[PDB]
Amino acid sequence: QLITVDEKLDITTLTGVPEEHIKTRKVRIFVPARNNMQSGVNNTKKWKMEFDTRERWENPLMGWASTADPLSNMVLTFSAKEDAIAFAEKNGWSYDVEEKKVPKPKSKSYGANFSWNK
Amino acid sequence: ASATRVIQKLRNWASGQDLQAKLQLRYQEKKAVTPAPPMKRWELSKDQPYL
Amino acid sequence: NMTLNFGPQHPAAHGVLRLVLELSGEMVRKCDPHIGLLHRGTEKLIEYKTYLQALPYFDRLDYVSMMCNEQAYSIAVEKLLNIQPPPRAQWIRVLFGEITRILNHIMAVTTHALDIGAMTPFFWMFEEREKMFEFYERVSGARMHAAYIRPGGVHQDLPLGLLDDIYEFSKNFSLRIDEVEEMLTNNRIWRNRTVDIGVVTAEDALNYGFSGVMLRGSGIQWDLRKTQPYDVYDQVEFDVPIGSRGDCYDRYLCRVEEMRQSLRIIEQCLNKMPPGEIKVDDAKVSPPKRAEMKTSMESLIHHFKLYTEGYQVPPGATYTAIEAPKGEFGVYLVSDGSSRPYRCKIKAPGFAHLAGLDKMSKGHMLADVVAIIGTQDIVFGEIDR
Amino acid sequence: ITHTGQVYDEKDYRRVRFVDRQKEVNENFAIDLIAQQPVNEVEHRIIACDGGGGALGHPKVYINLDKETKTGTCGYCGLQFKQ
Amino acid sequence: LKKTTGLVGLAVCDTPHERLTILYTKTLDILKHFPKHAAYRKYTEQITNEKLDMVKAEPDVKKLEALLQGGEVEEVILQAEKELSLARKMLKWKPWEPLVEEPPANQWKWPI
Amino acid sequence: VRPRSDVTHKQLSAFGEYVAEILPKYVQQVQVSCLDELEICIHPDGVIPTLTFLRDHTNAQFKSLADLTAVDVPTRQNRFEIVYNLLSLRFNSRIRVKTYADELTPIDSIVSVHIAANWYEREVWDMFGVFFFNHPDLRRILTDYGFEGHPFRKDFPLTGYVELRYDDEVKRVVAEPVELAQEFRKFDLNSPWEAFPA
Amino acid sequence: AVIPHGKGGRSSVSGVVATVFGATGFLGRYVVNHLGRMGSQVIIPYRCDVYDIMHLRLMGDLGQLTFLEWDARDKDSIRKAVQHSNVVINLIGREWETRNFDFEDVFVNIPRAIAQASKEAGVERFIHVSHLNASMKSSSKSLRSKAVGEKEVRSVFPEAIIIRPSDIFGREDRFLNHFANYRWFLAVPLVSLGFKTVKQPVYVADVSKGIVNATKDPDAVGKTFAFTGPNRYLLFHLVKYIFGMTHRTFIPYPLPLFVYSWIGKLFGLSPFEPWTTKDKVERIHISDVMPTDLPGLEDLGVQPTPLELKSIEVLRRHRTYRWLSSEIEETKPAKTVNY
Amino acid sequence: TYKYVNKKVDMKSATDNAARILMWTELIRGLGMTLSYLFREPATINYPFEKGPLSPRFRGEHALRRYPSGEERCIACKLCEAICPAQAITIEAEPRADGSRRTTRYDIDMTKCIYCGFCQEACPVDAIVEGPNFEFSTETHEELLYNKEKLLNNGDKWEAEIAANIQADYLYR
Amino acid sequence: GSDRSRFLEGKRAVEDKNIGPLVKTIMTRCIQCTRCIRFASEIAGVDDLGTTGRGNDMQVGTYIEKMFMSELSGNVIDICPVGALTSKPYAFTARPWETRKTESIDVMDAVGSNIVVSTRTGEVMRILPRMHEDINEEWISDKTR
Amino acid sequence: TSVKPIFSRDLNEAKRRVRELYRAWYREVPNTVHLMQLDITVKQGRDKVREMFMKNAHVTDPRVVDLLVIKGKMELQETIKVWKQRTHVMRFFHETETPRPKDFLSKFYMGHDP
Amino acid sequence: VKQDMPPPGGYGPIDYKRNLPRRGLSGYSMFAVGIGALIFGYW
Ligand SMILES: NC(=O)C1=CN([C@@H]2O[C@H](COP(=O)(O)OP(=O)(O)OC[C@H]3O[C@@H](n4cnc5c(N)ncnc54)[C@H](OP(=O)(O)O)[C@@H]3O)[C@@H](O)[C@H]2O)C=CC1
Ligand code: SF4
Ligand code: SF4
Ligand code: SF4
Ligand SMILES: [Zn+2]
């Protein structure tokens, strides 16, 4: 038989994350925009949640960039806004969702610009 | 090589075969359906069925 | 029940294995192998790399068998793309696929003996190995860890002259296998330490997923190369060396026999390798020839995109298994439409074999455990992945 | 010192490294080597630049030496061509 | 008659036809409890009935081995009682019943 | 073009229905991929029953377990997708049975059905965190003895959070939070242009 | 300067380039440890063979540690070491004045030239180290000389932090190991039967952190901090306690310091690092000065660590087959005599 | 097709067996084999004086080539960085005063490098090549990290052989 | 597109000119797509850029060399899909796969145009527009990029 | 809601298991400090077990608690046996790492991102 | 342009079978020489 729990699945205790990176890390759920450089829209389809950016100090010996934040390069991809919000809640990371903004329909017709009137 | 024709013969006698030929020095209702027809059991190798 | 860690640094234990053992007297009551002393992340790292830049990981998964492993990923990536390599490339892969089997068996039989205490077979056959490496180098550039077999065929045609040398060697290697037999196959002492040690039943071998010589040694007839042909191993003719009274000695005899049968397959490949190209002609999957990318725009674009971004395999998942020298090596490669894989569980013939150490070495002496780790050809790279 | 004049400085905390061990810098700096290269005169309006040797050069590009005002410079070799 | 089966652990079973007829008839019996139109009952009954019809029909074990495949006859014995064990197990499992629950929505959508 | 043999596509499809009818209860979806492979999908409760039928059925003997793995689709409510790939030496065929398990909803163990799984199930717990009931001895296999966190989860940083160095003061190896000297350069590789599905 | 960037661990930057001349020795091993942990640039001058300096390489990130060949009788070597350092720490010291270096050299002569150059260089701060209770009129030529130097160092690098530490105990310590090493001598010769010998011991780490902190702290300038300890002790309990953890019998035997100075002379005679020395003996039986007013370890941030706490680690190697498994809390901690 | 590796009392048979068992014959047979090789020429090479043969494709040690004129070949397209499996190559670039495109910093971390040889493959101008030398063992870890000046210097030293090696293998590629 | 080329004939070349100090027009790259001539007339009212000539030597560059000086100028870079004319300051400092892209807000002007700051190894390499229907619909000022 | 149970129907039953594990560790701390020759105090060690046990004291989810002890028990086994050599155990004490202050002013003075 | 291929007519044949030679003095003969040695030695 099933048991009842109203507790938001929080599994922060099982994930195995250091305390500092669960209480000081804000992740943003956003649908990636398109590099204006290209006109393809296949990278503006799935929602992604990305952890907040952290220190990137220069390395003294070779000048390479060096980072102390483990969750930096991690960007998880989630198909829908609801599912991504769920991941933040059970993992205990703070979230600030940004609504998808899709291009508004634009009316175009080759004949219209040929109008000397306007 | 450079067996000298006597170290080679001690080599051949001790080994029991000719190493000169193969030297170590390289030189220049409905039917029950199975997933696929049952595999035919493999044939005994004709060139040497047993070692 | 004395507890003792066989020890990571054991001259006998291949690589590093902590085999915690409880030994009643000298007899080994329990065998709980520990693993992961060589876990390195190979499966997670691949998710962050493109298909072609994950090919070098496969050579490192079990590097005794450097290439045969590469063929398994190749095949897998080719299936997902529904592309198949050109005819010459197929024969090559079978040519170097077999040469690699010999290399693994020379490793397994001679390293087995070094732990047993026979040291001269290793030096005898490591010289032959050496000569083979040179084939790798003159074909790939690297003695081992070549990266020659890529997802769409091999990388570059054989040098002009290799085939002839892969002949001289093959023409003689037999005698070299013959010499070792003399010393061990019938040594009044090899037999004792090997015969009737680690017998595995036929039903139990299938149950514990042994899938390798270990199954074949127990008399089960299964060679994925004959049952499910991959590449052109179908066009060749070889005899699987099945065994009876499966035990360390019998399986050994099987490994010496596949060394023999692989020379039969190598001969053919040299006798019948076709004129042709060694990589698919789809610039989409295979990188364009350097003369072409330096004179044709479509080829540069295809060179730039292939090296920088990737194949872009169509979404799907496949489990493709070959017959790597150790046993069934399979890659389950789940793939989203992206150029970089999503998952790539490597099935290692070896994760299953080690597990069997417990059910094989029961009521056995410390020396028996050393013999059984040898008869499983455990390369900790594949097990740890 | 070097190509882009890397000069760990008298006050840097890194110039410490060369103490008792020399620095890697280059003679025959390239910056001046092509400048030392003669301008390849041509007859045609446009010219190619395999880089010299075809496959062993650079992806072939066609340069427009159309204005004597400017000697076309293949973006790969830095070779100026004098119409 | 044979000296031994290829498989290491398996041992030659004398009276193999009798041993198979015993196991085959048992299974048929157990299946008799399965729900009438239960898929496992109809399918396995068909397979088992064909097996023993062949076992009763063939008095030569070597040809018997060819007729129902099975490699060596000893294996066929192991497969039959393995099936007998599962038939007993499935009666307890009751797989014939309707699906436990539908998969969560989008659980099986691979492109992601 | 690969040398597809429709002869197979059909026979395996037919088995897929066979299994679907034989175990209506646990099979949710069955499909023979264009790559000529069958992938019965079962409710997690059908782990024991579906495997056993395949290991011990005359018309479908699937004796050895090739592999047990768990892809992790973070989006999917049930995060893990335990996949079991099985072989039939008798019919020279294969089938994959894949179930879904969430982080704290354990799956049954099949060590009973195939003892091969004794190790792979420990591997899935160590890397992904799925738990297997009735497992003889579930304990980390690949990760370090004191490792905290399940590594192959998509939500775990590659470099991880801890790295080891020898400290003289304490004359013993000592973890420290990871400090990397050249962070993994995260090249973005997806192209904004798709490929018109054939 | 070097703006401090990073999270604080290895592969991070703190901006302290520091020559540390006596890194090769006991305390140096600790000074380089923290400096390296913090991420400071450390130039370690060395005249010991490269094989011995290897233990140092493992501590610090790629490029943090630079090793320079240096000879004390050559002023030029000190000159180039401090060329690019902004912090100079001096730990040069010995107990046996050697054939070609006498106490003046190791304590006063050399440590002067060093700070002298450091100034010419323009190093922000210099931290000379001289022994605690190094009265300018103490019994041991060493203590006398060390004081003589502190006078001089103040002239060359005025206000170069100076730290006078009390007996220092840590794995490889003399204070703690030496006594445990008297086992060979069946009985233990102690003046006033080990009484009349109050001493305060300080863990090597405690001293170090302080030193490091001194470099990164403004208040330290022109100070003479004296790292002392968390509890004083009559030499009797110390000796027995040691033998206690070592689990070896104790026979404290009175022997005139007069005759004993002679025993020190005997070992001193030995060519290879005399096991003991006239001076060491005097220093041993030299009581430690009072707290006075000098600031302390906690002043520099590192709260002292009691001896009993880490003694177990320092004295463990001296135990036997079984005694090797005993722990400090089942053992009885010795009483504290402040006197 | 399969094969049985080990499928298989007259006085003579029994006696011969006893002859073997008590005269240790199969053991004497083994001794003969080793005595035989003792007489074979050993295959070792004087390592410093004689070197094990490596053909043109040997990857060995990284070098950056220059055009015969003297202009370094690299034009900083940076896809050698993109296809590096180990993340070894770090490249940052800016337009040189000439206006051309050149790399301000090119750092191959050889300890990170796994010598795959893809960089050799990827370069369009073929500026980065796998040079023949394999003997570059270094006392300190820092020496193994290589900046543009070491690689360019490595390129100048081995250019003659690199050119010969690329000459031999380019038709194949 | 296709896997290979069949143009065994020779290629053409145009003459690089100066359109200003921000846009580097290596116009031998141009696919004569006339997006620039549109933007330069429709989004911005410059009406300077135009097509010149007919045949395969139609070059879309200012007939007389007059710099394209206007705000909204840098957008041509973003709008030319070819890399014929690109940004001169960000000439060769980076390559896009490496650039980590963080979405932020324009502070140079009060329109608060949305923008994406492309950072590599911790220093900003470029700022290019990201679309906000209401505020900056895919365009950003010459100042804020 | 509506979630299947693992080993405990309710937090109550689950807490029973935690009690057992605590006892287990409590009884074990002394042994480890002796079989590993660790330089720690048993009292100190048991404190650590307490701390680690308490660190997760907030949880009230039956299922989460059950896994937590499964995991806890596994750790015990390793420690009970010598699978976890000292380096492994002492890591719990975070002995070498320098503690970071949590005071705002402290962080301000040291790190860009707190 | 040339491609390394099997020589025309194919390569020669290789040995894939053990050529271990069953060569030995017959057992009776072996024992007789030995027993004869002991008889002479005893005399
Ligand atoms: N623990 C103690 O006994 C106490 C020590 N101190 C002071 O702390 C300092 C460090 O102590 P500790 O490390 O135990 O001392 P050590 O005997 O270990 O020597 C310290 C360092 O000084 C160097 N050194 C010694 N003599 C010479 C010389 N003639 N020329 C060049 N270098 C030399 C040593 O290098 P190398 O060996 O390679 O020459 C070594 O690296 C000492 O200077 C001492 O005065 C103060 C109070 C108590
Ligand atoms: S690829 Fe060749 S050219 Fe492009 S950057 Fe790497 S080296 Fe320079
Ligand atoms: S060799 Fe492979 S790894 Fe080493 S640099 Fe070239 S590409 Fe990167
Ligand atoms: S946009 Fe770029 S390509 Fe299209 S015309 Fe203007 S310049 Fe030529
Ligand atoms: Zn050019």
From Swiss-Prot, chain C:
Catalytic reaction equation(s): a ubiquinone + NADH + 5 H(+)(in) = a ubiquinol + NAD(+) + 4 H(+)(out)
Keyword annotations: 4Fe-4S, Acetylation, Electron transport, Iron, Iron-sulfur, Membrane, Metal-binding, Methylation, Mitochondrion, Mitochondrion inner membrane, NAD, Oxidoreductase, Respiratory chain, Transit peptide, Translocase, Transport, Ubiquinone
Cofactor: how and how many bound: Binds 1 [4Fe-4S] cluster.
Keyword Membrane: yes
GO BP annotations listed: aerobic respiration; cellular response to oxygen levels; gliogenesis; mitochondrial electron transport, NADH to ubiquinone; mitochondrial respiratory chain complex I assembly; neural precursor cell proliferation; neurogenesis; proton motive force-driven mitochondrial ATP synthesis
Localization per Swiss-Prot or TrEMBL: Mitochondrion inner membrane
Known cofactor(s): [4Fe-4S] cluster
Gene Ontology MF terms: 4 iron, 4 sulfur cluster binding; metal ion binding; NAD binding; NADH dehydrogenase (ubiquinone) activity; oxygen sensor activity; quinone binding; ubiquitin protein ligase binding
GO CC, alphabetical: mitochondrial inner membrane; mitochondrion; respiratory chain complex I
Family listed: Belongs to the complex I 49 kDa subunit family.
Name of the protein: NADH dehydrogenase [ubiquinone] iron-sulfur protein 2, mitochondrial
Source lineage: Eukaryota, Metazoa, Chordata, Craniata, Vertebrata
Gene it is expressed from: Ndufs2
Full-protein positions shown: 79 to 463 of 463
From Swiss-Prot, chain E:
Keyword Protease among UniProt keywords: no
InterPro entries with a match to the protein in the record: NDUFA5
Compartments where found: Mitochondrion inner membrane
Residue numbers bearing the N6-acetyllysine modification: 26, 32, 42, 56, 94
Entry superkingdom: Eukaryota
GO terms (BP aspect): aerobic respiration; proton motive force-driven mitochondrial ATP synthesis; respiratory electron transport chain
Keyword list, A-Z: Acetylation, Electron transport, Membrane, Mitochondrion, Mitochondrion inner membrane, Phosphoprotein, Respiratory chain, Transport
One cellular-component annotation, GO: mitochondrion
Modified-residue entries (N6-succinyllysine), positions: 94
The keyword Cell membrane appears for this protein: no
Residues modified as Phosphoserine: 85
Primary location class: mitochondrion
Mutant lacking the gene: phenotype: Lethality around embryonic day 9 (E9). Conditional knockout in the central nervous system does not lead to any visible phenotype until mice reach 10-11 months of age: then mice become lethargic, lose motor control and have difficulty maintaining balance. Defects cause loss of other complex I subunits and reduced NADH dehydrogenase activity.
Role, per record: Accessory subunit of the mitochondrial membrane respiratory chain NADH dehydrogenase (Complex I), that is believed not to be involved in catalysis. Complex I functions in the transfer of electrons from NADH to the respiratory chain. The immediate electron acceptor for the enzyme is believed to be ubiquinone.
Record text on subunit structure and interactions: Complex I is composed of 45 different subunits.
Protein family: Belongs to the complex I NDUFA5 subunit family.
Name of this chain's protein: NADH dehydrogenase [ubiquinone] 1 alpha subcomplex subunit 5
Organism: Mus musculus (Mouse)
Swiss-Prot record, chain I:
Positions contributing to [4Fe-4S] cluster 2 binding: 30, 33, 36, 80
Tissue specificity: Brain. More abundant in neurons than in astrocytes (at protein level).
Subcellular location(s) of the protein: Mitochondrion inner membrane
Residue intervals of the 4Fe-4S Mo/W bis-MGD-type domain: 99-145
Role noted for this protein: Core subunit of the mitochondrial membrane respiratory chain NADH dehydrogenase (Complex I) which catalyzes electron transfer from NADH through the respiratory chain, using ubiquinone as an electron acceptor. Essential for catalysing the entry and efficient transfer of electrons within complex I. Plays a key role in the assembly and stability of complex I and participates in the association of complex I with ubiquinol-cytochrome reductase complex (Complex III) to form supercomplexes.
Oligomer status and interactors: Core subunit of respiratory chain NADH dehydrogenase (Complex I) which is composed of 45 different subunits. This is the largest subunit of complex I and it is a component of the iron-sulfur (IP) fragment of the enzyme. Complex I associates with ubiquinol-cytochrome reductase complex (Complex III) to form supercomplexes. In astrocytes, less complex I is assembled into supercomplexes as compared to neurons. Interacts with MDM2. Interacts with AKAP1.
Family, as annotated: Belongs to the complex I 75 kDa subunit family.
Name of the protein in question: NADH-ubiquinone oxidoreductase 75 kDa subunit, mitochondrial
Organism: Mus musculus (Mouse)
Swiss-Prot record, chain K:
Subcellular location: Mitochondrion inner membrane; Nucleus
TM helices/strands, residue ranges: 25-43
Taxonomic superkingdom: Eukaryota
Segments forming a coiled coil: none
Family under the similarity heading: Belongs to the complex I NDUFA13 subunit family.
Subunit structure, as described in the record: Complex I is composed of 45 different subunits. Interacts with CARD15, but not with CARD4. Interacts with STAT3, but not with STAT1, STAT2 and STAT5A. Interacts with OLFM4.
Biological role stated in the UniProt entry: Accessory subunit of the mitochondrial membrane respiratory chain NADH dehydrogenase (Complex I), that is believed not to be involved in catalysis. Complex I functions in the transfer of electrons from NADH to the respiratory chain. The immediate electron acceptor for the enzyme is believed to be ubiquinone. Involved in the interferon/all-trans-retinoic acid (IFN/RA) induced cell death. This apoptotic activity is inhibited by interaction with viral IRF1. Prevents the transactivation of STAT3 target genes.
Designated name of the protein: NADH dehydrogenase [ubiquinone] 1 alpha subcomplex subunit 13
Species this chain originates from: Mus musculus (Mouse)
Residues of the full protein shown: 6 to 48 of 144
